[PDB]
Amino acid sequence: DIGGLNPCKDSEVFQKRLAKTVKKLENRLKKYEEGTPPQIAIQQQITQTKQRFTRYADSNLLCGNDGLPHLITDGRWSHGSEFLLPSILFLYISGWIGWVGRKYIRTVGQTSNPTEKEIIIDVPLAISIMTSGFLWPFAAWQEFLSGDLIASDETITTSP
Amino acid sequence: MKDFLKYLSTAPVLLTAWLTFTAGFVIEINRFYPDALTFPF
Amino acid sequence: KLKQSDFPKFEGSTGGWLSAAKNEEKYVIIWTSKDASLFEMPTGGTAKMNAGNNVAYFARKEQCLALGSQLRGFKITNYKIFRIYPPLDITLLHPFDGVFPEKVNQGRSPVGKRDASIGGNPNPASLKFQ
Amino acid sequence: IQKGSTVRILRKESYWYNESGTVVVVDQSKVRYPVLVRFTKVNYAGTNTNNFGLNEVEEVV
Amino acid sequence: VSFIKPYRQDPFVGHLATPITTSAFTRAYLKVLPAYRPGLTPLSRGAEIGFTHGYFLIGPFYTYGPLRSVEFSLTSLAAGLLAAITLLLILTVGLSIYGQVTYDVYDNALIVKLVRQMVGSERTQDLPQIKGTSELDTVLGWQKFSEGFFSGGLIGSIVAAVGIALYSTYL
Amino acid sequence: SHTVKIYDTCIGCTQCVRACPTDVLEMVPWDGCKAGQIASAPRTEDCVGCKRCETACPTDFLSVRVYLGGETTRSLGLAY
Amino acid sequence: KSTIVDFNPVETSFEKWAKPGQFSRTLAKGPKTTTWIWNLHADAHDFDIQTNSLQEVSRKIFSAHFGQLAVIFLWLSGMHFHGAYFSNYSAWLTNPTSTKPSAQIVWPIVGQEVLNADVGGNFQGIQITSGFFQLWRAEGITSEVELYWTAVGGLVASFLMLFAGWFHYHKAAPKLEWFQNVESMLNHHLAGLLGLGSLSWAGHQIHIALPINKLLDLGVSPEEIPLPYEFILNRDLIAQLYPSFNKGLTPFFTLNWGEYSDFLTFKGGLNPVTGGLWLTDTAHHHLAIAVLFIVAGHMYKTNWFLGHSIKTILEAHKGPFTGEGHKGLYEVLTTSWHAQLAINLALFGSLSIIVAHHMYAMPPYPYIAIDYPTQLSLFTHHVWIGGFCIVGGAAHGAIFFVRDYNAANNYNNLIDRVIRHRDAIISHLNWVCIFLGCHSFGLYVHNDTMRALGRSQDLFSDNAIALKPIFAQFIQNLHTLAPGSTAPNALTTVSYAFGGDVISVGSKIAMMPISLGTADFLVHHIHAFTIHVTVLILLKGVLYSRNSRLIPDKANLGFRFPCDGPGRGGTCQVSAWDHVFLGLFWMYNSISIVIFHFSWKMQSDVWGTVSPTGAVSHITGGNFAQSSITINGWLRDFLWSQAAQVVQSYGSSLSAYGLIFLGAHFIWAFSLMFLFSGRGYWQELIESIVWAHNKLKVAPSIQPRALSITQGRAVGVAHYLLGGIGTTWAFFLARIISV
Ligand code: CLA
Ligand code: CLA
Ligand code: CLA
Numbered sequence A: 001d002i003g004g005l006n007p008c009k010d011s012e013v014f015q016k017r018l019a020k021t022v023k024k025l026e027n028r029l030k031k032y033e034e035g036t037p038p039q040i041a042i043q044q045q046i047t048q049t050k051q052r053f054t055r056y057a058d059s060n061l062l063c064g065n066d067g068l069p070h071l072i073t074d075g076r077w078s079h080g081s082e083f084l085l086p087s088i089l090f091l092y093i094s095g096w097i098g099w100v101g102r103k104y105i106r107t108v109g110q111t112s113n114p115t116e117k118e119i120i121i122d123v124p125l126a127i128s129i130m131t132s133g134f135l136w137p138f139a140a141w142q143e144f145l146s147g148d149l150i151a152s153d154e155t156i157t158t159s160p
Numbered sequence B: 001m002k003d004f005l006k007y008l009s010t011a012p013v014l015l016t017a018w019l020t021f022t023a024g025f026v027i028e029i030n031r032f033y034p035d036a037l038t039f040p041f
Numbered sequence C: 001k002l003k004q005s006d007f008p009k010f011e012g013s014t015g016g017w018l019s020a021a022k023n024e025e026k027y028v029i030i031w032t033s034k035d036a037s038l039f040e041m042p043t044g045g046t047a048k049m050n051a052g053n054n055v056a057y058f059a060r061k062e063q064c065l066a067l068g069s070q071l072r073g074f075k076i077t078n079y080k081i082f083r084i085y086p087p088l089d090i091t092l093l094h095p096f097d098g099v100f101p102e103k104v105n106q107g108r109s110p111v112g113k114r115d116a117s118i119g120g121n122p123n124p125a126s127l128k129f130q
Numbered sequence D: 001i002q003k004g005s006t007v008r009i010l011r012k013e014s015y016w017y018n019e020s021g022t023v024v025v026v027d028q029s030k031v032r033y034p035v036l037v038r039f040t041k042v043n044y045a046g047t048n049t050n051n052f053g054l055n056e057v058e059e060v061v
Numbered sequence E: 001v002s003f004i005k006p007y008r009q010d011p012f013v014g015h016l017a018t019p020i021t022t023s024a025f026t027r028a029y030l031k032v033l034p035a036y037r038p039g040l041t042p043l044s045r046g047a048e049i050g051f052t053h054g055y056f057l058i059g060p061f062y063t064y065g066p067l068r069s070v071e072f073s074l075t076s077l078a079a080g081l082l083a084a085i086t087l088l089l090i091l092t093v094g095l096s097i098y099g100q101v102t103y104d105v106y107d108n109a110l111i112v113k114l115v116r117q118m119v120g121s122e123r124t125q126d127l128p129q130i131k132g133t134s135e136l137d138t139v140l141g142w143q144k145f146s147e148g149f150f151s152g153g154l155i156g157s158i159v160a161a162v163g164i165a166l167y168s169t170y171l
Numbered sequence F: 001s002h003t004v005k006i007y008d009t010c011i012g013c014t015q016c017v018r019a020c021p022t023d024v025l026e027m028v029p030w031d032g033c034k035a036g037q038i039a040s041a042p043r044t045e046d047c048v049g050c051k052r053c054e055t056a057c058p059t060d061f062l063s064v065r066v067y068l069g070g071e072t073t074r075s076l077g078l079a080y
Numbered sequence G: 001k002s003t004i005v006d007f008n009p010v011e012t013s014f015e016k017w018a019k020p021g022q023f024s025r026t027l028a029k030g031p032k033t034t035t036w037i038w039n040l041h042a043d044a045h046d047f048d049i050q051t052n053s054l055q056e057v058s059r060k061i062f063s064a065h066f067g068q069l070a071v072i073f074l075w076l077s078g079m080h081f082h083g084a085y086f087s088n089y090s091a092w093l094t095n096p097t098s099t100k101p102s103a104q105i106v107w108p109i110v111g112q113e114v115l116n117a118d119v120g121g122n123f124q125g126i127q128i129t130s131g132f133f134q135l136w137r138a139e140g141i142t143s144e145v146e147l148y149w150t151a152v153g154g155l156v157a158s159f160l161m162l163f164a165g166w167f168h169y170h171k172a173a174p175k176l177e178w179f180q181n182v183e184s185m186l187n188h189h190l191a192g193l194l195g196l197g198s199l200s201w202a203g204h205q206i207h208i209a210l211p212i213n214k215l216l217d218l219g220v221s222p223e224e225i226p227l228p229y230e231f232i233l234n235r236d237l238i239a240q241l242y243p244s245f246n247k248g249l250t251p252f253f254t255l256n257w258g259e260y261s262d263f264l265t266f267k268g269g270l271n272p273v274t275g276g277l278w279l280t281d282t283a284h285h286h287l288a289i290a291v292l293f294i295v296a297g298h299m300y301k302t303n304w305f306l307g308h309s310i311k312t313i314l315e316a317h318k319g320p321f322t323g324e325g326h327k328g329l330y331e332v333l334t335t336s337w338h339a340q341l342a343i344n345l346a347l348f349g350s351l352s353i354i355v356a357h358h359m360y361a362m363p364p365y366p367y368i369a370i371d372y373p374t375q376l377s378l379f380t381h382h383v384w385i386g387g388f389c390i391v392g393g394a395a396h397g398a399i400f401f402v403r404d405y406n407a408a409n410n411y412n413n414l415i416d417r418v419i420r421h422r423d424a425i426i427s428h429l430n431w432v433c434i435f436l437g438c439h440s441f442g443l444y445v446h447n448d449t450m451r452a453l454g455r456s457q458d459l460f461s462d463n464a465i466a467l468k469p470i471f472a473q474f475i476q477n478l479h480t481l482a483p484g485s486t487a488p489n490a491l492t493t494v495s496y497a498f499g500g501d502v503i504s505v506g507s508k509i510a511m512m513p514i515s516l517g518t519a520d521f522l523v524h525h526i527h528a529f530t531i532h533v534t535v536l537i538l539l540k541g542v543l544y545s546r547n548s549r550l551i552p553d554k555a556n557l558g559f560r561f562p563c564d565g566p567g568r569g570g571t572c573q574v575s576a577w578d579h580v581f582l583g584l585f586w587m588y589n590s591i592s593i594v595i596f597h598f599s600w601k602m603q604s605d606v607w608g609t610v611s612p613t614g615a616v617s618h619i620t621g622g623n624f625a626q627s628s629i630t631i632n633g634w635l636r637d638f639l640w641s642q643a644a645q646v647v648q649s650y651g652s653s654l655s656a657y658g659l660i661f662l663g664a665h666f667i668w669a670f671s672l673m674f675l676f677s678g679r680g681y682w683q684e685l686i687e688s689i690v691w692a693h694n695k696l697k698v699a700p701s702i703q704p705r706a707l708s709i710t711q712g713r714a715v716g717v718a719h720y721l722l723g724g725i726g727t728t729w730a731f732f733l734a735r736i737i738s739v
């Protein structure tokens, strides 16, 4: 399909990889005894390996000639769960972190001892700001509009 | 317990607690839903 | 024991002057002490002052000045440093006008003074090929 | 400008250039740099105050 | 008693009078060496130094060279002799250039007195200054020293080769 | 020998002079500051370039500046 | 109002916990730049600059020692708890020669359960190379319940040491005179601590370890072995194994000590069953050590008209060559903690290295000689600890010289006379270092270039120009002849390394004569050269810590400073700290070469298997003798060859070793950013980053500053050491566990 890849559900090398891993795990399982915790752990390993391979097969995942899932990150929504949705999730979380950090910096920057409140965090104010970051996309595009997001010329510059 | 709570509010203790909590929920997500290569949806 | 009676009671160290302070220049520091205090040489180890005139020779001006700075801790202030060329060419160096450089004395003219801050320095591109 | 006034540093070779400081005292004598300004941010040497000329400081409204 | 004292009663020299720097054994041993033995012209000092140095220099080249032989070989001896002679030539070249760039004097122990008496108001470093009063510290003295080193090195290397051959053959 | 320049931002606090290890700087009368004194560099032939002078300078970007230049047995700190 | 302690000196309060940097006069005002944060940790334990009183520094040091001992006890309790709960110690007891010791199981997350290896005994976990199983077996511990109780005791002891530290800082802090009783302290540490510890351990060995281990070697399973207390209440369970307890303590009090030859032997060699030292020999050794140390503890005058005064001993040791001699050394070592730390750390690291040598040389634990990973790990770890401690001793000697050295109090004594001729010492040490390096390494390079040029007969090899270590071979011959000639009451040599028979346990070689040839000559001279260069750097740091021809007042700049300036042609790293930094680098080099020599020589010429007919086959096959004489040989037949197991560990239970190999490479390369660069570039880059932050109104109030020059060097050296040591750690562990 895309880039010459093929779905992993029809990739023979993918099933060969699964079979080889299961065979190695079973051979390891053979050298232990009865329902002893080592055998239980190896059986859990086998079950998890089978579940992971089955989930990857039924996941709209494209496999190359090596039988490994390749990620299609050109931007198409068909393979949108590989990069685009995790990209949105990370952008949300990281914007949350950056927004709460910036808000805390600007909030304790207007107190008597701004530097003290950076090594000794005001946990009440920190908790107040941190749970308010869920609106960071909206807060950012409400502070940029008011001109409160960017400094203009009070920023320092070197000699040249 | 007025200065002890202030000690717990210091940068190292707070960072250690936050990173321990963060690693904790990451590890537990990866335990309950392991081997997640793509978005579940 | 020693060449001169005013030398500090030092046992000699392999950190003193070398062939340079026999053909280029040597520095001598003189001072008078009330007590035979035990002090640390700028070159080696511990020496003993004389209860009176003290004279020490060094290879660098910095060594003599370090010794003098140590002397200030002994409430010794009259120390004076001279430069001796290969022959007996003595030149008083440190108390140049009899007053230490940290105290303002009349009769000193400013040397190396620019009537502007750092930002007034000329651009290097205008100082090419001169 | 006077004591307690807020000024912007116009000296380019300054750790507080384009920044705002608080005037501690403006000397009335014939010194070259009478304006003494105190800043909240220490410079690279650790100091937080410096003497500036009358044309190197601009009062903030 | 104390066996370490300031050198020549000067506590400011970078030196000490230890039982090795200023011992009678050290005095006599260094005064019998060619470099400091009294009554020797610079040519004689160079000749003796070259003889000794070539004599002990042929050894390592012949024994451990690229053409060794557990038995006696004329080729091994010739190789060691040639290597020693060429090394002496390199050392003589170094001596010659060092003397060329170091001194500008033809008769020492006088010029110092002349400029300490009749004044030295010139470009200095030739009239005034002048480090060392030995005859080895002149342009002429060092040239003869290098010549003696070179000739004595050749002669001593040849003598040592002959001795090595005799020892390996008749013993 | 190195080059040492003094600039009129000098406040005459003497910290440069009392930090020089080779007695290069000295305090001279002046009328451009409250202290009535300014640093001078009349013995730059002894300047070693250690820059202790400008480590003790409290003015914003320094009032004593050391420009390293040609080397000498005095400026190289050679005891030999 | 006791005469030794002060009661309630410091109030137990949490107020100062909320004020970081309260100890320092400079840091107490609060942070203004990020340099304050780093200065906070760099001055935490520098008690000299926190108080101006030696008494307060001593009390802080005493409580810090208590905290450290509590930490050590907690670590030991954790080890015993892991042995009790997460180990296969019981299975390893019944099959020491076929079960690999494991005492750490790994949780099944993110696929990391592959690290649980097939260590044997129906167990999965990480193979343990600390030798705790062998130590516990030598202690007579035959059950995991005993390990649990030892862990509980360790926890109780750790709490006790914590309480002791709190008590002796806040409730009853000793006075300076108590700390300065060096005669009493030496008497107690020599008699009580050392001698009585040896005596108590000899008692434990004789009554618990001797019978239990004898029964274990006889084949008795641990379940039917009597509980250890039964060997004390019943004089018949121990009198069957050692038929000399039937006479009781009467032979001891009647001076008929020959009767106790049953369990106090002098045999030498190794136990043929376990491959370790005879535990009867060990018990006799500890008894003799106890008596010797107890006797040695009655030397210094403490409170009666009896014993020696260390001041009078030192002051009487003058000489013609040494002026006043040791006069003033007693005042130096009783008023400066840094001098004591220097001596103790140097001798402590040297002792650690000696311990490392004697460990593999004479394996003291049952079934530890045939556990090659344990032997390799123990040697390498102890040598690393020794090198670090020696560098620390040099560092604290330099610190004493900078800070606590008084010129007036040391007029014409040994310290003064050493400083007075430091030039001669350093110049001759420089010449020796150049001579040794030229020779050792250039002989290596000559071998390499002769081999590369196809001239095999021109090498410094055994089949070529040969450099036989005749002096060491003479000593080896003297030791193998000692039993019956110079040690007439010995039955076997102290170690089979000096010569004798091949000792094998379960077809695996325990010890064997270590032949010394031209390959050992070169590597030994490499060791000497590296040690000499490290000594050169550290001694130059100590001697030139106060002054020099460059900076005549270097003592006024302190122990830790980056430079004096770009003048004098450049005065970088003139400190004494910058010498402990370079010396750390050279110690890493020396110890790395030492452990490489040990690993290759053991694998190639000691360790291996013995055929039933007596044929010895080694791990590598004797390639050390002919291929360790060239640098290409070290690169190929050792590094490249034995790195195969590390690089091929992916997918196996040793994959963690490959991951740590790669990560240690990454950290070592990361160090070079700090080691090669300078502060100005990073400060000017932080300037633009701060511009961006200010543009987005997110510039922190604590101004971010690049790490100071000294801290940049410290970070660089710490990362370099961590990366190199971790790379060697992963390489050694993977290689010696795979094969
Ligand atoms: C939490 C606040 C915060 C915010 C909003 C930003 C924002 C920014 N940083 Mg930044 N930074 C921060 C903290 C922050 N930084 C810290 C703590 C450090 C020290 C490690 C840096 C080091 C740093 C460098 C070296 C660079 C930036 C750069 C940038 C810009 C591009 C984004 C980027 O590369 O991220 C960079 C982010 C990191 C390197 C990791 C930050 C470390 C953690 C995640 C942040 C700290 C969280 C904090 C403890 C939360 C506490 C708040 C709570 C008490 C309420 C952007 C202006 C770049 C730039 O100038 O581009 C224009 C750049 O080169 N930053
Ligand atoms: C026979 C008596 C005796 C014994 C056994 C010890 C033992 C010890 N002393 Mg000690 N000491 C003694 C007498 C004694 N001392 C006297 C008389 C003085 C006064 C001059 C000192 C002054 C002194 C100082 C100043 C320091 C020590 C330190 C140490 C420890 C060294 C660390 C070590 O080797 O770890 C081995 C560890 C163990 C074997 C663990 C078990 C040891 C336990 C704690 C028994 C300790 C015995 C104790 C003195 C009994 C007092 C109990 C109390 C209720 C009165 C060690 C525990 C150093 C230390 O670490 O500080 C804590 C230290 O800095 N001692
Ligand atoms: C008995 C051992 C001992 C003791 C008591 C001390 C005590 C002291 N040393 Mg010292 N030192 C030691 C051993 C010791 N050292 C050794 C072995 C070395 C050689 C490396 C040194 C080298 C040394 C130097 C070069 C200096 C000191 C200094 C000091 C003083 C201040 C220490 C401080 O505040 O650090 C506080 C503690 C820290 C900053 C901890 C830093 C963290 C380390 C560097 C990294 C450890 C990594 C660890 C192994 C984990 C890595 C694993 C990774 C995967 C994460 C203090 C008196 C300093 C001083 O000014 O003395 C007056 C100083 O300049 N020491």
Ligand code: CLA
Pocket (backbone or CB within 6 Å): G429, G430, G431, G433, G434, G435, G436, G437, G438, G441, G442, G445, G533, G536, G537, G582, G583, G585, G586
């Ligand atoms: C492979 C890299 C390397 C090498 C070769 C050296 C070599 C040396 N270091 Mg070292 N060093 C290194 C890395 C290295 N270092 C690193 C990374 C650091 C950073 C921490 C240091 C830090 C350091 C310090 C701090 C010190 C040294 C010292 C020394 C010298 C010890 C004396 C000696 O053996 O001289 C003999 C020279 C050699 C063994 C080099 C090879 C010479 C060959 C084998 C023989 C001669 C070849 C011949 C002349 C070639 C002629 C032909 C040619 C003209 C074409 C020596 C020059 C010490 C010193 O100054 O010397 C006493 C010292 O104090 N080093």
Ligand SMILES: CC1=C(C/C=C(\C)CCC[C@H](C)CCC[C@H](C)CCCC(C)C)C(=O)c2ccccc2C1=O
Pocket (backbone or CB within 6 Å): G673, G674, G675, G677, G678, G679, G682, G705, G706, G707, G708, G709, G711, G712, G713
């Ligand atoms: C990068 C660099 C800096 C800048 C480095 C800085 C500012 C350090 C920043 C450290 C951050 C802020 C905290 C550490 C973050 C790590 C992720 C934590 C360590 C990892 C743990 C597992 C220990 C210097 O200041 C410097 C100075 C002198 C020589 C070389 C250099 C140099 O190379």
Ligand code: SF4
Pocket (backbone or CB within 6 Å): F004, F019, F020, F021, F022, F023, F024, F025, F046, F047, F048, F049, F050, F051, F052, F053, F054, F066, G567
């Ligand atoms: S460099 Fe700076 S400090 Fe050193 S002498 Fe010249 S001026 Fe004085």
Ligand code: SF4
Pocket (backbone or CB within 6 Å): F009, F010, F011, F012, F013, F014, F015, F016, F017, F038, F039, F053, F054, F056, F057, F058, F059, F062, F063, F064
């Ligand atoms: S340093 Fe700057 S301020 Fe301090 S004295 Fe010299 S000139 Fe005046």
Ligand code: SF4
Pocket (backbone or CB within 6 Å): G562, G563, G564, G565, G566, G570, G571, G572, G573, G678, G709
């Ligand atoms: S900065 Fe680096 S280079 Fe410049 S002086 Fe200090 S150390 Fe020497």
